[PDB]
Amino acid sequence: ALQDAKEYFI
Amino acid sequence: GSHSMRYFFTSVSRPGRGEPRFIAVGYVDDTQFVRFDSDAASQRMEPRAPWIEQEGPEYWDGETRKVKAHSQTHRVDLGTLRGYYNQSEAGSHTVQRMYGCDVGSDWRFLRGYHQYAYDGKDYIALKEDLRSWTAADMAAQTTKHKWEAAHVAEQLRAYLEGTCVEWLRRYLENGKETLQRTDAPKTHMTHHAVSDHEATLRCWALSFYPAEITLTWQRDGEDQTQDTELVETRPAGDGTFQKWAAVVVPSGQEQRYTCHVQHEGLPKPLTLRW
Amino acid sequence: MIQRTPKIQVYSRHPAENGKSNFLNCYVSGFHPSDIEVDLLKNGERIEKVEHSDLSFSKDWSFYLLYYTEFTPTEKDEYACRVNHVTLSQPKIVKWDRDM
Ligand SMILES: [Cl-]
Ligand SMILES: [Cl-]
Ligand SMILES: [Cl-]
Ligand SMILES: [Cl-]
Ligand SMILES: [Mg+2]
Ligand SMILES: [Mg+2]
């Protein structure tokens, strides 16, 4: 199952 | 043996019109089990192995939500990276991400990975310790310092050592009839005269799983690489793999040559001789 | 801006026997960027119902795809794989050899 990304951005 | 779960994501910008093309695929070991393609009509995560179809509607809704969220994150990332690298809006560029976990033979967490590439080159990767980052260039330093400040690695570690491993174990059990089965290579040798005085011996390995294999030729008990040819391991299309190794030999001397096949499906390496 | 030219192998799923239904594969790998055109040919002509795998990639980030179709090898029929990529000046065509 995928990670449930708070979200992190480049 | 150990087992792995890996997700591979590719996002390609489309400067002429619209959102990036986004393709996500999930693998357990060498078996693909899910896929999402932004250009497909369903707009859903879709099964690609029978054992994942054991999962109920909640799984597919959940994975679809998350995969769409990943697609938007990559879209944002493409924009940010164009900025970091001072590139124009006119070109197409590519972000790739891979992440996942391995469990060992002990059924416990063994290792985790989480890494990115931009335009085909390393950008940033989580290190083996899952606590720090490898930045490939100065642009990636920006990402590294931001993620260190936000303690991203700690969040990823929780998924990689926990959730990821739990799901991998679940998949291995549900799909045990294939995922936990090795398919030993079916081997044979062919002979192709190239003249009255020389012949090509080709040692074939077919229908094997997983993909890792070693084929080596020896002449009179020693490794022989000269006048050999080895092809890259290739998918059969039915979930198995193929490889062959060939050597050219003097006609009448075929008996000196042996092909040695190593694969985990084999209790002991095979030795083939014409 | 890495550009890597595709490696190509063209081969059958099962050992080829004339008259016996099989699957013709064209495996393209080691390429970047991902945009690529792949066709399977029969006697120089494009085969129409060709399927392909979902785009994935290797440790060095280079992409791979498998294109495949059902086919029945014969003594006279010729098969090939035609690949175009930004790294190629024109399409590369590799003829299918049942012994490889
Ligand atoms: Cl182990
Ligand atoms: Cl490391
Ligand atoms: Cl089966
Ligand atoms: Cl496939
Ligand atoms: Mg999670
Ligand atoms: Mg195509």
Question: Rounded to the nearest whole angstrom, what is the distance from the C-alpha of residue A3 to the centroid of ligand 5?
Answer: 4
Residues of chain B with CATH 2.60.40.10: 182-270
CATH for C99: 2.60.40.10
Experimental method of this PDB entry: X-ray
| Residues A7, B73: C-beta atoms closer than 8 Å | yes
- Across the interface, of C23, C54, C56, the residue whose CB is closest to B237 is C23
CA gap B30, B14 in Å, rounded: 30
Residue whose pair of structure tokens reads 């390393």 in the numeric block: B122
- The answer to whether C55 and B10 are in contact (CB under 8 A) is yes
**Contact by Cβ (8 Å): B130, B156:** yes
Tokens representing C17 are: 């026997």
Query: What are the chain B neighbours of A9 within 8 Å (beta carbons)?
Result: 73, 76-77, 80
Note the maximum CA span of chain C: 46
Q: Of C12, C50, C55, which to mutate for an interface test with B (greatest number of B Cβ within 10 Å)?
A: C55
In chain C, what residues touch B94 (CB-CB under 8 Å)?
32-34
Pull the structure tokens for residue B107. Answer: 């059924």
**Residues near C59 by beta carbon (within 8 Å), at least 6 away in sequence:** none
The CATH homologous superfamily of the domain defined by B1-181 = MHC class I-like antigen recognition-like (3.30.500.10)
Domain that holds residue C9: 1-100
Q: Which ligand is nearest to the CA of C54?
A: 4
Q: Do C25 and B237 touch (CB under 8 A)?
A: yes
Instruction: Report which bound ligand comes closest to the CA of B155.
Output: 5
| B86-104 burial: b if 16+ Cβ within 10 Å, else e | eeeeeebbbbbbbbbbbbe
Q: How many residues does chain A have?
A: 10
Which distant-in-sequence residues (6+ apart) come within 8 Å of C36 by Cβ? Answer: C6, C28, C63, C65, C83, C84, C85
Helix (H) or strand (E) holding C70: strand C63-71
Q: Which residues pair with residue C65 across a beta bridge?
A: C28
Residues B259, B273: Cα–Cα separation, whole Å:
6
CB contact under 8 Å between B66 and A3, yes or no, is: yes
Structure tokens that stand for B37 in this block: 């393609």
Under a CB-based contact definition with an 8 Å cutoff, are residues C95 and C83 in contact? no
Spatial separation of the C-alpha atoms in residues B6 and B114, rounded to whole Å: 10
Count of domains for chain C: 1
Number of H helices, E strands in chain A: 0, 0
Cβ-contact B99, B114 below 8 angstroms: yes
This structure's resolution (Å) is 1.7
Tell me the CA distances in angstroms from C97 to B199, C42, C52, one per residue in order: 17, 13, 21
| Ligand 2 centroid to residue B39 C-alpha, Å | 35
Token pair for B190? 């062919």
Task: Chain B: give the shortest CA distance to residue A3, in Å.
Answer: 7
Instruction: For domain B182-270, give the fold.
Output: Immunoglobulin-like (2.60.40)
Q: How far is CA B117 from the centre of its chain?
A: 15
Delimit the CATH 3.30.500.10 region(s) of chain B.
Answer: 1-181
